[PDB]
Symmetry: C3
């Protein structure tokens, strides 16, 4: 009656929010965001050394891009191609050389290394970038690569 009518109204509000929010999400993701599954990649539009880009992500409430999938990597790669800038991933074998780990300290459930990589070139390459072709290369942490954080 008066409850029928006000739930019926609660109905319209929630539909209005889904359409509005839906169109808003599109707006947010253009042009510096990629959506794939339940994760979002977003670029900061610029480049920084690993430690500098790493802290950018953590405090924004997310973390460096950690594609655990060829699908996540291809989307991330869509972002890297776009800026025409190779980007850091979250992974680092700085604990123990030769074995790369996610920031929790876990081990890689997925990789997309480029031929010859990782080679720890110079005896000092413990971070990872992703190329415009989507493939991986371990590299020194002090190099400035595109900042892309996952959410």
């Amino acid at each position: 009656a008066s409850l029928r009518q006000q739930v019926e109204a609660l109905q319209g509000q929630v539909q209005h929010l889904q359409a509005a929010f839906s169109q808003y999400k599109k707006v947010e993701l253009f042009p510096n965001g990629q959506s794939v599954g339940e994760k979002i990649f977003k670029t900061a539009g610029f480049v920084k050394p690993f430690t500098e880009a790493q802290l950018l992500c953590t405090q924004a409430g997310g973390q460096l891009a950690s594609p655990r999938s060829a699908a996540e990597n291809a989307a991330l790669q869509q972002l890297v191609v776009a800026k025409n800038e190779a980007a850091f991933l979250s992974m680092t074998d700085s604990k123990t050389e030769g074995k790369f780990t996610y920031p929790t300290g876990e081990s890689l459930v997925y990789s997309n290394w480029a031929p010859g990589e990782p080679n720890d070139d110079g005896g000092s390459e413990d971070c990872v970038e992703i190329f415009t072709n989507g493939k991986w290369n371990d590299v020194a942490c002090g190099e400035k690569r595109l900042v892309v954080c996952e959410f």
Copy 2:
């Protein structure tokens, strides 16, 4: 009194939600977006040729700015005025020389041609740009113009 305090719940949350979403809408629209009606113009902030720009928009789940009225053209000019870059529109007479149409193929319902426009200069100008003064000029689709999508 049960579902009374069950729907009074969702209602509360739906309300707090609408406030949040409302403040956040105005945050994304700053500074690279305009809201006019139910349409949302958003500029990337850089220039591209028509085809690259067109792709960008289609891929963000939208398309190139297609002002359909005074009010809409005015909102779009804002973005243009602000970036001091002439932007591209979706409209083309690539099919029938002299007949400009939206991507859907439909003929124009509004226009704002600059005095003496279009002129298909050089014997080839199939695309459209909006100036900082609002008026329209046709241009070669190879030109790099400001990218602005509509959602």
Copy 3:
């Protein structure tokens, strides 16, 4: 009635909506935003003079950043440091010299002045900027500093 078949509905949506929005929050605030309480500071990412910038904010539905607590101030300081540009605050003493107020003509409830500030250098400094250390300074309103709106 059959209403309990429909509140079981609003429930799930509101749930899905709230979670989905909660993630785009972190998404949007990166890299140019910072929340603090229920206020958001958002940088336009460039520098303009007081008059021009205060308009970009007021036309975006907001206003020039008005930190009113040590917290709100610390948050704003975050942005300024990141972009490495001292930013304008909303407050001026153009009405009455030596007397700083908000756009509401209201008088300050928090300040974090640099030592010996404000000094109205050359008797021509009616505006406020905030340094990369969080400290305040009264500057020429004609000067161009970082644009940051509070929403």
